[PDB]
Design a binder for this molecule. Structure first.
Ligand SMILES: Brc1ccc(CN2CCCC2)cc1
Ligand SMILES: Brc1ccc2cc[nH]c2c1
Lengths: 167, 452
């Protein structure tokens, strides 16, 4: 049996956080997505030579069901904490998400990555140095991704798997 | 083959090509019609009012999702343009009137009828759109169309105006004694029934206008998705109320009674097909302040542990068991809305608005069909109501629940967690004891009705 990594995407709604996972799963030259099937949230990958399966939970659209976060978070081994580089409130919310993951997993050391997502051509309000300083204060990696080009997407997820393997 | 006018005098006469319309490989299952994948707005309007056949699925899909690629004002103009068929520059002319003009003209009137009947919100929100629709409908002349023109006018005016259920169960609280109503004093069967009625009505009030274009996630969500948001907030509120009930009962024996009663309410939600109610309970049990209460869980009867565990398992593996179980039941039910919300959002975000063929932009209609399929599934569970009597005082109690009070989310959430730590400290701190808070008996009347 190959290793299966249960990953959870968390972050503010309304800022295109869903693009991260959709871009990962859908083939690099395919744009036809159906979220109502198994293959839409599962992907077999080779990372550092070791083949594995990534099971990704993204509840984008369910942000108002705030009392269901703990339930959703407890399913994960690793977390992608996503904010939009054009939405400072989504960046400021990260601290709350991380603290909630730590409370749910009952651990101060939970495999986690910070992801700054460039979700449109609106102006950047969060400088890479701000996010790099925040990620450093938490002791975690920071990865920036582009929703249009797929740049950084694989690096974000693969870095998280490495964070789990090196836990 | 017929002779239609030139594209210079009539845009809908332009022939089909790879540059203006594309299809899926399959056909409509019950109708034998091709499935349009993409096309220009002109071609989508042409097929919305096609002369060869009626296409109710396409009309329904189109009218539910067109606002992402065409404005109401622009659609009305396009259909008024479609209706005004010029005669081409006798036998050929008499056939054109019976095989092209009469069918197309009747198809635009049918679209007008469906628009006003099922999507009147466009007219409520833009009184000039309605003025123009009535101006147009007033100009339509013909004995064939008088019937359809009259019916539309009747809908506009209507739209412009705007056996025995079981015996209500009572436990410690008696009818009218609203001051004593609480989790352990109201009958668990009646809590579940009255919550199912509230939650069914909330579910049934959500319209596709609140979902198409992912508008419940946008800055104007309070304007555009008010009924959906009320529904999610009721749900969130009940979860928090259950968690509050648990962690504020400091005495272990009393807290075990509280949890056991919530599991009974869950068991009745399962009987009633209230999956929203079920997941409200599962969410409270999986919350940080409750999930860690091991001394409470251990004291729960084995049958109730298994009831809860099976409910919990419905959410596992991306709602695999929940989804199978929802497909197997028949109405009335109260689905969990969250799955639909995620599916609609991801369909819209994971698919392009336009496809390009030979440098020409085609509206991606299949993306819209996929969203209309999800909204159709929501609607199929909104038709059937429950055969349950409303108890106006219990209903009002649950409507006015406010476990958070004036506190903000974090403040209340931290208070619940600190109460959890107090009542059952982290190991190796021993378990304290706490005095009883209930002056009435904790024994449940069970989940089976008291009278036949
Ligand atoms: Br009350 C209550 C306390 C604890 C839990 C979660 N447990 C995890 C393993 C068995 C159940 C649920 C309810
Ligand atoms: Br809620 C809940 C979560 C996990 C388990 C395992 C057994 N019973 C459960 C209830």
């Amino acid at each position: 049996h190959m290793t299966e990594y249960k990953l959870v995407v968390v972050g503010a709604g309304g800022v295109g956080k869903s693009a991260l996972t959709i871009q990962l799963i859908q083939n690099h030259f395919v744009d036809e997505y159906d979220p109502t099937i198994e293959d839409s949230y599962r992907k077999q990958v080779v990372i550092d030579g070791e083949t594995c399966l990534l099971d990704i939970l993204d509840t984008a659209g369910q942000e108002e069901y705030s009392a269901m976060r703990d339930q959703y978070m407890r399913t994960g081994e690793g977390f992608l904490c996503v904010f939009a580089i054009n939405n400072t409130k989504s960046f400021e919310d990260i601290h709350q998400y991380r603290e909630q993951i730590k409370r749910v997993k009952d651990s101060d050391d939970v495999p986690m990555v910070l992801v700054g997502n460039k979700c449109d051509l609106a102006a950047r309000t969060v400088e890479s140095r701000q996010a790099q300083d925040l990620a450093r204060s938490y002791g975690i990696p920071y990865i920036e991704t582009s929703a249009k080009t797929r740049q950084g997407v694989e690096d974000a997820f693969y870095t998280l798997v490495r964070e789990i393997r090196q836990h | 083959q017929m002779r239609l006018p030139s594209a210079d005098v009539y845009r809908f006469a332009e022939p089909d090509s790879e540059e203006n319309i594309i299809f899926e490989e399959n056909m409509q299952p019950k109708a034998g019609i091709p499935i349009i994948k993409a096309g220009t707005v002109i071609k989508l309007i042409e097929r919305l009012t096609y002369h060869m056949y009626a296409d109710p699925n396409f009309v329904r899909t189109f009218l539910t999702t067109y606002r992402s690629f065409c404005k109401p004002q622009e659609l009305l103009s396009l259909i008024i343009e479609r209706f005004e068929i010029p005669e081409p520059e006798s036998a050929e002319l008499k056939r054109f009137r019976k095989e092209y003009i009469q069918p197309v003209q009747l198809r635009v009137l049918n679209v007008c009828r469906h628009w006003v009947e099922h999507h009147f919100y466009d007219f409520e929100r833009d009184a000039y759109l309605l003025q123009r629709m009535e101006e147009f409908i007033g100009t339509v002349r013909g004995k064939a169309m008088k019937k359809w023109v009259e019916s539309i006018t009747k809908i506009i005016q209507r739209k412009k105006i705007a056996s025995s259920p079981p015996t209500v169960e009572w436990h410690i609280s008696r009818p009218g004694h609203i001051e004593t109503f609480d989790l352990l004093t109201l009958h668990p069967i009646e809590i579940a029934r009255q919550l199912t009625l509230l939650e069914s009505d909330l579910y049934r009030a959500v319209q596709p206008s609140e979902l198409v274009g992912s508008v419940w996630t946008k800055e104007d969500k309070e304007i555009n998705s008010p009924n959906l948001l009320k529904m999610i907030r009721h749900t969130t509120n009940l979860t928090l109320w259950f968690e509050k009930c648990i962690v504020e009962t400091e005495n272990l024996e009393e807290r075990v009674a509280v949890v056991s009663r919530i599991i009974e309410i869950l068991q009745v939600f399962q009987e009633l097909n209230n999956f929203n109610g079920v997941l409200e309970v599962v969410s409270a049990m999986n919350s940080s302040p409750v999930y860690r209460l091991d001394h409470t869980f251990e004291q729960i009867p084995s049958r109730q542990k298994k009831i809860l565990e099976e409910a919990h398992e419905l959410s596992e593996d991306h709602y695999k068991k929940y989804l199978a179980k929802l497909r197997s039941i028949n109405p009335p039910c109260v689905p969990f809305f969250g799955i639909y919300l995620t599916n609609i959002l991801k369909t819209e975000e994971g698919n392009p608005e336009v496809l390009k063929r030979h440098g020409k932009e085609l509206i991606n209609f299949s993306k819209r069909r996929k969203v209309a399929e999800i909204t159709g599934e929501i609607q199929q569970y909104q038709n059937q109501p429950y055969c349950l009597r409303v108890e106006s005082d219990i209903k009002r109690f649950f409507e006015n629940l406010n476990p958070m009070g004036n506190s903000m989310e974090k403040e209340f959430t931290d208070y619940l967690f600190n109460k959890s730590l107090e009542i059952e400290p982290r190991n190796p701190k021993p378990l304290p004891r706490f005095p009883k808070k209930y002056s009435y008996p904790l024994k449940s009347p069970g989940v089976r009705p008291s009278n036949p």
